[model samples]
Target: MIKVEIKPSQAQFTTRSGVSRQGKPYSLNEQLCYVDLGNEYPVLVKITLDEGQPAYAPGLYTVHLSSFKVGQFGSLMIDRLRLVPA
Candidate 1:
């Protein structure tokens, strides 16, 4: 299990280097912004299980992102979720 956190203007997702999967990389033109929060940016959190690295095994694993700030209750958002098989 690997945990990654990044705070920046633009988010990035790569194969194994920056992604959760090993060989399975980010799909082409993979741009997801449904979780965008405009200017109010909050620290993003991600948890990854390496290739064939069972524990949080395949099929529907939920990652929770939330904030404690009074005005940041809704700041918790998913930057981009990329799922791949080992």
Candidate 2:
């Protein structure tokens, strides 16, 4: 099993795109922040699991984020905001 903890940041409100399921919006304009790897201009949230994780078994696990506008009408910009992991 994987032993990990994610201290998620405050949730924000954003509009959904056309990609929806059962009339529910699928594509969301808001994205919850993950880990941030070393980057000049981080367009996506990046995360790397430490060595010897039970889940990965003996492989590498990577997490990434994509840029999405806020509230649909909000300007397209990258937010440095992130969730603090324990």
Candidate 3:
């Protein structure tokens, strides 16, 4: 199982990369957000590859899965997703 973390600003999904399954749109039922001190946290994910071209196995394919400060509870456990690959 792979994991990904994309920033809200860069979380633009559509032509770039959106949720799908069997060539159809898919997503979680519903969920709540994370707030640190009553502030919406800023989540971010970076893509690092060797080829430097265009690919989408994942922003979810990397050791960048989870990186956070000592007690960044929200950052440590926030983004949760799923996809039924056709």
| Model 3 Cα shift for residue 10 (angstroms) | 4.1
lDDT per residue for candidate 3 within 6-85, as digits (tens), equals 32443333233356655875332221121123236533433332222232332222233333234455444523333222
Clashing pairs in 1: none
Please give the ranking of all candidate structures by lDDT, highest first, separated by commas. 1, 2, 3
Q: Quantify all predictions' global Cα lDDT against the true fold.
A: 0.34, 0.33, 0.32
The alpha-carbon lDDT assigned to residue 31 of candidate 3 equals: 18
Give lDDT tens digits, candidate 1, residues 28-83. Answer: 33221223234465334344433443333223222333321334466645443534
TM-score of each: 0.17, 0.22, 0.20
lDDT value for model 3: 0.32
All candidates in order of TM-score, best leading: 2, 3, 1
User: What's the distance in Å from true for residue 13, model 3?
Assistant: 14
Greater-lDDT candidate between 1 and 2:
1
- Number of the top-ranking candidate, with TM-score as the measure: 2
Backbone clash count for every predicted candidate, in the order shown: 0, 0, 0
